[PDB]
Write a protein that binds this DNA or RNA. Structure first.
Ligand SMILES: [Mg+2]
Lengths: 135, 67, 79, 169, 254, 237, 97, 190
RNA sequence: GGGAUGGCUUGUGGCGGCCAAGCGUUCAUAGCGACGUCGCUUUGAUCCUUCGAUGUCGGCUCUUCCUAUCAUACCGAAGCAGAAUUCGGUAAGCGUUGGAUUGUUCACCCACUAAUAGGGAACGUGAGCUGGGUUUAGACCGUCGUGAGACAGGUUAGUUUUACCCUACUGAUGAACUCGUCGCAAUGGUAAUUCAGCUUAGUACGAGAGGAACCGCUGAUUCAGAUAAUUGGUUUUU
RNA sequence: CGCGGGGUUAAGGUGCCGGAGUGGACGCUCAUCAGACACCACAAAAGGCGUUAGUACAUCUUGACAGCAGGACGGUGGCCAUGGAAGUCGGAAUCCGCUAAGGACUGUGUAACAACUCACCUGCCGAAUGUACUAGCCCUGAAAAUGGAUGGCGCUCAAGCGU
């Protein structure tokens, strides 16, 4: 099973490949650099992109040194690009942030700093278990 | 006739008998005729006839032809 | 194959002059080459070819053989 | 212009061009026996010699494990060992008694644990950068072999801060 | 895990057919004499390289799929030695690796020659020479490929025995009730029959005791003679008794 | 499942109920299927099918002939040489190949162009056939290297066949004696068909009448190395 | 020679030519297939597009994520005054249609 | 070679009425009537004897002569169908999921319909519509058996083949998965 | 002043010997000869042997075609238990991506993905744009030359700039038939595609580890056609 | 080979385009892009359960080929080997009896047996067959890339092929 989750509605993707987001858990990393998005299609010249609740492959540019040499799966929990939910509400967060997970969706860290998105919380049960506030 | 059944060549030891078996049967019967006093004719109709071996063994002083 | 519903590009039976001339030239060259090889052929050839004979299904083969014996005996007696 | 490529008949084509005597062969074998290497001597012109008759033979261990595989296959083929027509019944064992089997098993377990510890002592990782492949390209090594083929003397240059590091064995 | 993930091993002729069909059908085939000589060289060089790469990936799959007996647990090593003759096993895989190396060397040599070939006829002769030498090298592997396919099937059907878990090991003579006991305590389908040596290979079942998983190993019977007179069937049981840290249940019929 | 589980299932449950009759019908249709394949396949698949079926007919005919003839070493060797793999073993001093196709200089050499202008200098010539450069070889400097013998076309060994002993051995090349087309080609060491070369015959174990060891002899190249990638030679004995 | 990278066509050839429509009023190209066992009914109507607005819908779509929830959807309003029937055309079948 | 005359004969039982007009054969017996148009084959029909139907081909090739054997067997099968009938017994077997077979007779069409459920645990309902004139009965003497009977051998065997082919095991090992419905016996009703 | 191999090619080496059904020969018993076979060309190793640009390619945008099918659809076979596959067949309908690397034959790595298949329409010379082979005049270094200069070479900077013509294509009008409304449909074009999740079901199957599918339901990827309620963006509403 | 009129032909044609025959006689061929101006290459002693004409050898009312009903046996579980191996995992031998005939076995099958089956024989039946080659015509015997070519339509007891 690849890391692309099922039962996700369409939303505005705000984070293409090359974006640096904050690292919202306590794994030791401070930022995550997107190099791939799980479940991305094939199209000429189009950059792969992900939204809140998507799994991406991210390297660490800043943080704890032994995290800097590997490529980690991560779930985007906050994005700054405004998107619409099915209740007609357009919304956005003040930063882009994700959390490091394994391909099964279980988190590397133990705590989440700040809020997480409803999409991420509903698609990943461990993120909902480690979230203090869900918006 | 290009369309025909492929005749199977049998890779087995025993071949067809032919006219030699017929002449051998002729010679055996004609040489067993002068050596005996009676020639019976018997019938085994719609029967398996595998007990004729036992009949031949029990009548060892007689000669039986079943050709 | 799906030839009937979706046929492919047809193969042209219409020749070209260049191909006809090349084929004729190569045929003539092959004829000359096999003539040369027949002249320089090392294979043994019989002076008299093996005659096939009289067919078996011919009804009068036996009386023809009777005749053939009659002319050979007649020639032996005459010579 | 196409020439006539013809070879004339000649008695020289069917004679021995080079011959050697047994005394000369033994002398050359003794010469290689007493050979030593001197860094201050250089080779200027090789002597054309039948080196296969003068060089000493390979070691017996090398000559035995060179042929062990084909020897086993000749002794017992693949089809007679495993398969629908296999005739193999007794295995090949390194032990003969129950005590030897017990000792061999405990030594095998100890060696297996030691190798596991060695491998243990020795997310996916990022790919190695292509800059660290520099100096290994086909063009560069074509250049190197071209220079080697062209040159009589080769100055191999070593950094004094790391000579064995910069040495190209 | 097991060894069911080894890909099937074709014969020598099937290997040649597969590789040459890949070369014929996954590459363009039409080259013209009136083209540029660099184009002709690129065409035939690509043919040779693609043939070698297909051979290399098949041989590498065969080599990296089979177990390495130097890296196994001693029970698995000795079991594979009993079943498949470890000497023959290593010789066959060494022949496969040597053929892979020789095919790569042939490819490099003929690519270097194709760099200097001057006409389409010479390029064609060099390409056919390289492909024929590769086909000859594959043809010299007829018996190891058949042996390795048989060994692959037997490994795929081999039971999975964890050598470092809780285990009951049932041993004894034939016809004493070993398979009957294993059937009664586990779910394994080991046959029970009144003749000797009904069970000719190791069987394993599983049971639960106090919320823990135990594995139970049914063995072929062992006769009373020294180990130089034991066959492979009994030596499976001897290997299990010698290398598996177990609780031994020796069955006797009074 | 473990061990022969498909065989155990086969014994416990049988086949599918139509398996025997179904296989019998397929084997019965096999003749019509072979004829349809013979008349309907196209291209390389058809060519390979026809070649395979030709081979099958040949071995079938051989087997039938052997079953018809059911009811009906060569050279003297010692007992220690018995059951081994032994070779079959089969004035005018003319070579086996007295004449080969001549090679012109335009085919032999190609012009290597030099210079940075549009008009190139063309004095360099590259040798397009395999060569033997000999021992202790060092290439000329590029300013004075008219004839370019590339490293990838240089050879040192040949597969030499002895006509009498019926053995082919890989032997080192000692020298190029005579290229039949040109003494310049002989000087450059070009290995083409019909070329007389000197080979090292130490492995063949040839002893002369005086007891000396003959380790250098003459062979003739019997193939085209530029087309084959290998040098094949036959010893002139 | 071939394209190094594949890419699908821009646009659809089904909607060619990209020309102006020959009439302002849309043409019903096909009507639903007639079934004589059905009761008599009309197949079409006309209206005028007035604009669009927003709604909240109470969704009952089992298996969907927004099941038993409220959804905001865009809707288009078409003003439909009643039509007046003034005529009747009869059609026969011919080998030309 | 063209043969001047070739002849085939078909015996007809006493309780059979056969009418041939323009190579359309109608065969009537106790069990009903059968009809077959044989105008694609050049044949001359005649009454060579009381109770014998003669088939002639004049100036025909070997293929045209050989087609008369097919015509003979087809008409004899029609006669056997209207006298004794044809009967195919099929058995459905299963390992774990019992195959649920329901046989109904459709009112407006008059044909039988066979519904198959729980084939290897599948939730789909397979439905096979029989050829007209074919009666399907779930057997009471034996277990898990259908009986398809009729006058047309073509229709009965084709319906049996349709039932057999709708229950195919797909993407599974057929040595291990033995589930299916198979023709077990073929014969006459009488 | 003169110029600017081709019904070719594809999948299976060469040399040497032997065998050989057959072809020939039977005043000579030679010679050809498929199918094959035998010789030369590491116990899963080594990583201390990369062997020469005279021949030049690219990239972008975009259309179409071939099948020699990578994926998707269906089918045959395999110890194919299940799962995942392997070999093969019909099939071009539909897709076939995003990047790094120029101390360099830019080809190999990395990931995503259902998959990241191969070619033609140029390269059997050749005005779309723009980088390398590549090369007018300025300049430097290396090699050669007494020198003018030339090159084994390496580096730097450097002038072609249509379209309003005919045709093709895309759109737009239109004379003759009174004007107009409602229609028909010859012919041309044609369109959708892939994955995931719920259920079936932790079920069939399995010693265990594991682990499907049909029907039913819901989304998403790529494509296509529209639209502006809402959210963004755009502001000469000056 | 001057400019014209009439007549007759050559090569080539007479289904239509196209002037002249849907002309006559006997046959052959059905091609999932037949063939019609072929000879050269692919290509070979090539592959065809296509179709016809022949040649040679062989069987046959003393019953041939195909089938159906039966038999298919005894020494003997032949020797060695194998945990087991009885014709049928292997190696080597491979004879005798009863015979009408039956292999120290052709395959399926069994752990091994058993059981089935084939070779071969008898009964029923009923008249012509079997095998291998040769010659014709037909299929395959390798093909890329804009849509197209026996000149085109089209032609099948030809409007194809031989005389
Ligand atoms: Mg038992």
């Amino acid at each position: 099973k690849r890391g692309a989750p099922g039962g996700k509605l369409k939303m505005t993707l705000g984070l293409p490949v090359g974006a640096i987001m904050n690292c919202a858990d306590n794994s030791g990393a401070r930022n995550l650099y997107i190099i791939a998005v799980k479940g991305a299609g094939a199209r000429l010249n189009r950059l792969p992109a992900g939204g809140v609740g998507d799994m991406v492959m991210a390297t660490v540019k800043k943080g704890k040194p032994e995290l800097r040499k590997k490529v980690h799966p991560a779930v985007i929990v906050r994005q700054a690009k405004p998107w619409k939910r099915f209740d007609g509400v357009f919304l956005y967060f003040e930063d882009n942030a994700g959390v490091i997970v394994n391909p099964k969706g279980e988190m590397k860290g133990s705590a989440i700093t700040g809020p997480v998105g409803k999409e991420a919380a509903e698609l990943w049960p461990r993120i909902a278990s480690n979230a203090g506030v869900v918006m | 006739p290009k369309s025909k059944r492929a005749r199977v060549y049998h890779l087995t030891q025993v071949n067809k008998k032919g006219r030699e078996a017929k002449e051998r049967l002729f010679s055996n019967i004609r040489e067993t005729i002068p050596k005996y006093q009676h020639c019976f004719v018997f019938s085994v109709d719609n029967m398996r006839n595998n007990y004729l071996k036992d009949v031949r063994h029990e009548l060892n002083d007689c000669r039986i032809f079943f050709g | 194959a799906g030839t009937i519903n979706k046929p492919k590009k047809p193969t042209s039976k219409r020749k070209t002059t260049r191909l006809r001339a090349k084929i004729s030239k190569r045929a003539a060259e092959k004829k000359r080459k096999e003539r040369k090889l027949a002249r320089k052929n090392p294979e043994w050839r019989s002076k008299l070819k093996k005659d096939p004979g009289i067919p078996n299904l011919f009804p009068y083969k036996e009386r023809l053989l009777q005749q053939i014996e009659e002319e050979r005996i007649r020639r032996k007696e005459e010579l | 212009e196409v020439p006539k490529a013809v070879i004339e008949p000649n008695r020289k084509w069917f004679t021995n061009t080079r011959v050697i005597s047994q005394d000369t062969l033994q002398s050359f074998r003794e010469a290689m026996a007493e050979k030593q290497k001197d860094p201050y001597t250089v080779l200027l012109k090789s002597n054309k010699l039948p080196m296969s008759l003068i060089r000493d033979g390979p070691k017996l261990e090398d000559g035995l494990k060179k042929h062990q595989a084909k020897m086993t296959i000749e002794r017992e083929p693949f089809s007679e060992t495993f398969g629908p027509k296999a005739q193999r019944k007794r295995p090949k064992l390194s032990f003969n008694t129950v005590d030897e089997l017990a000792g061999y098993s405990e030594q095998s377990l100890d060696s297996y644990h030691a190798r596991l510890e060695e491998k243990k002592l020795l997310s996916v990782a990022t790919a190695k950068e292509a800059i660290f492949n520099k100096g290994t390209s086909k063009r560069i090594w074509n250049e190197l072999y071209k220079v080697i083929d062209s040159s009589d003397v080769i100055l191999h240059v070593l950094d004094a801060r790391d000579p064995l590091g910069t040495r190209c064995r | 895990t097991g060894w069911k993930d080894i890909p099937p091993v074709p014969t020598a002729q099937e290997f040649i057919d597969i590789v040459l069909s890949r070369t014929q059908r996954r590459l363009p085939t039409q080259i013209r004499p009136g083209f540029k000589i660099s184009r002709i060289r690129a065409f035939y060089t690509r043919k040779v390289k693609f043939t070698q790469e297909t051979c290399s990936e098949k041989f590498g799959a065969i080599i990296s799929s089979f177990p390495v007996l130097s890296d196994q647990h001693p029970f698995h090593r000795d079991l594979m030695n009993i079943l498949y003759d470890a000497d023959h096993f290593k010789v066959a895989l060494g022949q496969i690796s040597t053929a892979k190396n020789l095919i790569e060397t042939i490819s490099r040599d003929y690519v270097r020659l194709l760099k200097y070939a001057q006409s389409l006829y010479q390029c064609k002769q060099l390409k056919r020479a390289a492909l024929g030498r590769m086909a000859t090298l594959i043809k010299r592997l007829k018996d190891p490929l058949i042996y390795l396919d048989q060994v692959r099937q037997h490994l795929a059907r081999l039971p999975d025995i964890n050598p470092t878990t809780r285990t009951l090991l049932v041993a004894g003579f034939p016809n004493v009730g070993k398979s009957s006991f294993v059937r009664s305590v586990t779910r394994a389908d080991t046959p029970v029959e009144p003749y000797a040596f009904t069970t000719k290979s190791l069987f394993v079942g599983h049971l639960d005791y106090k919320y823990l998983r135990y594995q139970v190993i049914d063995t072929p019977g062992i006769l009373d003679h020294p180990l130089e007179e034991m066959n492979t069937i009994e030596m499976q049981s001897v290997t299990a008794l010698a290398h598996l840290r177990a609780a031994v249940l020796y069955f006797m019929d009074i | 499942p473990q061990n022969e589980y498909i065989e155990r299932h086969r014994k416990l449950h049988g086949r599918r109920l139509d398996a025997e009759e179904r296989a019998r019908k397929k084997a019965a249709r096999e003749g019509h299927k072979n004829s349809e394949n013979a008349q309907n396949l196209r291209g390389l698949r058809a060519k390979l099918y026809a070649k395979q079926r030709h081979a099958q007919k040949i071995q079938m005919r051989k087997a039938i002939k052997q079953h018809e003839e059911r009811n009906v070493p060569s050279d003297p060797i010692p007992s220690y040489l018995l059951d081994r793999a032994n070779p079959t073993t089969a004035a005018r001093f003319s070579v086996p190949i007295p004449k080969v196709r001549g090679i012109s200089e335009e085919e032999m050499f190609k012009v290597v162009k030099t210079g940075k202008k549009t008009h190139k200098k063309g004095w360099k010539r590259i040798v397009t056939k395999p060569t033997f450069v000999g021992p202790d070889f060092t290439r000329r400097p590029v300013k004075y290297e008219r004839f370019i013998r590339p490293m990838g076309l240089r050879y040192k060994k040949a597969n030499v066949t002895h006509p009498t002993l019926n053995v082919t051995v890989q032997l080192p090349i000692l020298s190029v004696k005579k290229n039949p087309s040109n003494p310049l080609y002989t000087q450059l060491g070009v290995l083409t068909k019909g070329t007389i070369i000197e080979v090292n015959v130490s492995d063949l174990g040839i002893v002369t009448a005086s007891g000396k060891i003959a380790w250098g002899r003459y062979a003739q190249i019997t193939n085209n190395p530029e087309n084959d990638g290998c040098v094949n030679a036959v010893l002139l004995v | 020679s071939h394209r190094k990278y594949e890419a699908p066509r821009h646009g659809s050839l089904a909607f060619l030519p990209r020309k102006r429509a020959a009439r302002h009023r849309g043409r019903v190209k096909s009507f639903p297939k007639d079934d004589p066992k059905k009761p008599v009914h009309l197949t079409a109507a006309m209206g005028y597009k007035a604009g669009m607005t927003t709604i909240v819908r109470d969704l009952d779509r089992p298996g969907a994520k927004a099941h038993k929830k409220e959804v905001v959807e865009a809707v288009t309003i078409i003003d439909c005054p009643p039509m007046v029937v003034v005529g009747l055309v009869g059609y026969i079948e011919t080998p030309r249609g | 070679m063209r043969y001047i005359h070739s002849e085939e004969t078909i015996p007809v039982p006493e309780n059979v009425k056969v009418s041939i007009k323009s190579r359309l054969v109608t065969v009537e017996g106790p069990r009903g009537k059968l009809q077959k148009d044989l105008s694609h084959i050049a044949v001359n029909f005649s009454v060579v004897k009381k109770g014998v139907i003669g088939l002639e081909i004049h100036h025909g090739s070997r293929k045209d002569v050989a087609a008369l054997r097919t015509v003979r067997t087809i008409i004899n099968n029609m006669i056997i169908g209207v006298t004794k009938g044809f009967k195919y017994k099929m058995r459905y077997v299963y390992a774990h999921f019992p195959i649920n077979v329901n046989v109904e007779k459709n009112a407006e069409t008059g044909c039988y319909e066979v519904e198959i459920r729980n084939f290897i645990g599948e939730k789909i309902v397979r439905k096979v519509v029989m050829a007209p004139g074919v009666e399907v009965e779930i057997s009471k003497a034996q277990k898990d058996e259908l009986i398809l009977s009729g006058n047309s051998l073509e229709a009965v065997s084709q319906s049996a083949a349709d039932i057999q082919q709708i229950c195919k095991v797909r993407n599974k090992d057929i040595r291990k998965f033995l589930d299916g419905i198979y023709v077990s016996e073929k014969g006459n009703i009488v």
